[PDB]
Design a protein around this ligand. Structure first.
Ligand SMILES: *C(=O)N1C[C@H](NOS(=O)(=O)O)CC[C@H]1C(N)=O
Length: 269
């Protein structure tokens, strides 16, 4: 109870970090001005599943120079299946389109779909090369599922920073890294995400149309990265949130991310 009350009472990111005895990295980015507010914006955190947003972007980018790549069918083998494979588990022994694998990995965070897409694009090195070409010198993809979700202090594999990921979401989901139809498809997948109802979305008011991608690991990490489109029109905002908080429960980590959303909504005003 005391921890829950301290989380609810926190009105700024530093106080919220203290309330959960964690390490919290947040960037709130105004795309009209480039202005950012946050906490630990340039510290490294494990991407965990949040990298899947950029794996899908790498696929879409490759499809712009490989006609019909999105329609290519990829076998789903029994040996490819992992514990978290909510969509691909139904297709073991048959195949799925690249496009449907992308959707599955964004909106359900399907780990098998991510590994199959890694095989399509050329692995973590291809995702990192896409990130670098897009202008992100910080974020890096190094490993496959599920090993990529590990984190060690000082080990930069599969990490980002809140500010690097916020800028990348702007360039890729809103900017000109991808062709318009490609970026719109990616935006739609993020808008359709099914795993974030208790995270940033739970703290953001109805004035925002939200697209997001979550992530977590079993030790202490819980993340959510989001694009906020004002339903009334105007410039979008980007909100990234990376948390490590081993002293609280998985469900309390969601509460922290929801509180990030409530604080951010108030700061936008
Ligand atoms: C991604 O971080 N993961 C995939 C899956 N879904 O969780 S998410 O919805 O938060 O992404 C299980 C947890 C995690 C993982 N360990 O792979």
């Amino acid at each position: 109870a005391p921890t829950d009350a301290a989380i609810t009472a926190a009105s700024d990111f530093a106080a919220l970090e203290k309330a959960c005895a964690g390490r919290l990295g947040v960037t709130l980015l105004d795309t009209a001005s480039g202005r950012r507010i946050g906490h630990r914006q340039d510290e490294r955190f494990p991407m965990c599943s949040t990298f899947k947003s950029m794996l899908a972007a790498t696929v879409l980018s490759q499809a712009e120079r490989m006609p019909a790549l999105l329609d290519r069918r990829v076998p789903v083998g029994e040996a490819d299946l992992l514990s978290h494979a909510p969509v691909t588990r139904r297709h073991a022994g048959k195949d799925m389109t690249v496009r449907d694998l992308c959707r599955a990995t964004i909106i359900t965070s399907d780990n098998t779909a991510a590994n199959l897409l890694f095989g399509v694009v050329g692995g973590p090195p291809a995702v990192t090369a896409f990130l670098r070409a897009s202008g992100d010198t910080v974020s890096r993809s190094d490993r496959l599922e599920p090993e990529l979700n590990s984190f060690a202090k000082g080990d930069p594999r599969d990490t980002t920073t809140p500010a690097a990921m916020a800028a990348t979401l702007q360039r890729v989901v809103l900017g000109e890294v991808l062709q318009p139809a490609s970026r719109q498809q990616l935006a739609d997948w993020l808008i359709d995400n099914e795993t974030g109802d208790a995270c940033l979305r739970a703290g953001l008011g109805k004035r925002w149309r939200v697209g997001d991608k979550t992530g977590s690991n079993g030790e202490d990490a819980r993340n959510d990265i989001a694009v906020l489109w004002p339903v009334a029109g105007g410039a979008p905002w980007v909100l990234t949130a990376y948390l490590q908080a081993g002293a609280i429960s998985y469900e309390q980590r969601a509460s922290v991310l929801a509180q990030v959303g409530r604080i951010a909504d108030r700061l936008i005003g």
